[PDB]
Design a protein around this ligand. Structure first.
Ligand code: NA
Lengths: 49, 48
């Protein structure tokens, strides 16, 4: 018999390359559009007594 | 005579250690009830 010769050792992974950057994450808009209005009307009351 | 290493019986002094990497997993979006479903659960919608 002979002894097994040294095995090929594994290699450490290269490591994930990361791009740095700035981000803005947008979501679907569910808020209603809001604005200001003015109602002009007249309450008309006819009372039969 | 002459021999190769393959022609000789091989015994190992090495202790085995089989380490495997944890595999990449993807999480899909998942909701029990969508917000549309929750809105629709009401019997009467005042706006409509
Ligand atoms: Na040896």
């Amino acid at each position: 018999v002979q002894f097994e010769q040294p095995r090929r050792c594994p290699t450490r992974p290269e490591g994930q390359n990361y791009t740095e950057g700035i981000a803005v994450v947008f979501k679907e808009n569910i808020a209603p559009y809001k604005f200001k209005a003015t109602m002009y009307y007249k309450d008309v009351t006819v009372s039969q007594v | 005579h002459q021999l190769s290493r393959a022609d000789v019986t091989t015994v190992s002094t090495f202790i085995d250690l089989n380490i495997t990497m944890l595999e990449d997993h993807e999480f899909v979006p998942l909701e029990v009830y969508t917000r549309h479903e929750i809105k629709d659960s009401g019997l009467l919608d005042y706006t409509e």
